[PDB]
């Protein structure tokens, strides 16, 4: 969508501090598990070592 | 092609409905305002349409606006526009067949001698 909420920054003790950051527009991008799978299963082959007899 | 297919008389103030992609065409200078529904609109076509002052809808927005698709003009791209269709039809090397052959490259000595010249052999 287009509505970007106001996320709260938490302190190291677990409680909320006074700082608020608006939600980045990255988190409203479309969810495409097919493209994530296509990118993952093609980029995961790039760290492979060759094997041969 | 969208401008010419919506410039026709009678179809003013209508929604052009595209199932494919609305791409920009840069050999045109004036863009009138257009109410657009498409699956995808390219980034430079979107800028030109919104600067012209029209609206760009998606298909859920079109379903909310006109559930029965009233006041709409369905449009589609040229289906024979692809390069694949020049190699289709009657075979090359046959009388009255302007079918593009499959060559590794084009040039002087790439399939231009025996089936093409009246001097060397024959011409179809």
């Amino acid at each position: 969508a287009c509505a970007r909420p106001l996320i709260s920054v938490y302190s190291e003790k677990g409680e909320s501090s006074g700082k608020n950051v608006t939600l980045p527009a990255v988190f409203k991008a479309p969810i495409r598990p097919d493209i994530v799978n296509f990118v993952h299963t093609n980029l995961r082959k790039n760290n492979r070592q060759p094997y041969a007899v | 092609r969208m401008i010419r297919k919506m410039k026709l008389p009678g179809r003013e103030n209508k929604t052009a409905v595209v199932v494919g992609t609305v791409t920009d065409d840069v050999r045109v200078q004036e863009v009138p305002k257009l109410k657009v529904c498409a699956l995808r609109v390219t980034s430079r076509a979107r800028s030109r349409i919104l600067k012209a002052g029209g609206k760009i809808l998606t298909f859920d927005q079109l379903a909310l606006d006109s559930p029965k698709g009233r006041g709409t003009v369905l449009l589609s791209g040229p289906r024979k526009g692809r390069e694949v269709y020049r190699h289709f039809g009657k075979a090359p090397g046959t009388p009255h067949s302007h079918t593009k052959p499959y060559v590794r490259s084009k040039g002087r000595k790439f399939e231009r001698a025996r089936g093409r010249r009246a001097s060397r052999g024959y011409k179809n």
């Binding site: 479309p30 | 699956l39 995808r40 998606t58 298909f59 859920d60 909310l64 559930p67 029965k68």
Partner: protein
């Protein structure tokens, strides 16, 4: 979606194919619901043919 990426050369967030994705709220909206026919939810199973003779 209106400001491009500053640390990349030319990258924008991708466009949404479908803005409102909650098709339940889309379908039970009065805009869509008035332009529908009556639902034919009556089940008509097969009839055992008795001989009229």
């Amino acid at each position: 979606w209106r400001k491009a990426a500053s640390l990349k050369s030319n990258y924008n967030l991708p466009m949404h194919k479908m803005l409102n994705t909650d098709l339940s709220r889309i379908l039970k909206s009065p805009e869509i619901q008035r332009a529908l026919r009556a639902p034919r939810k009556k089940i008509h199973r097969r009839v055992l043919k008795k001989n009229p003779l």
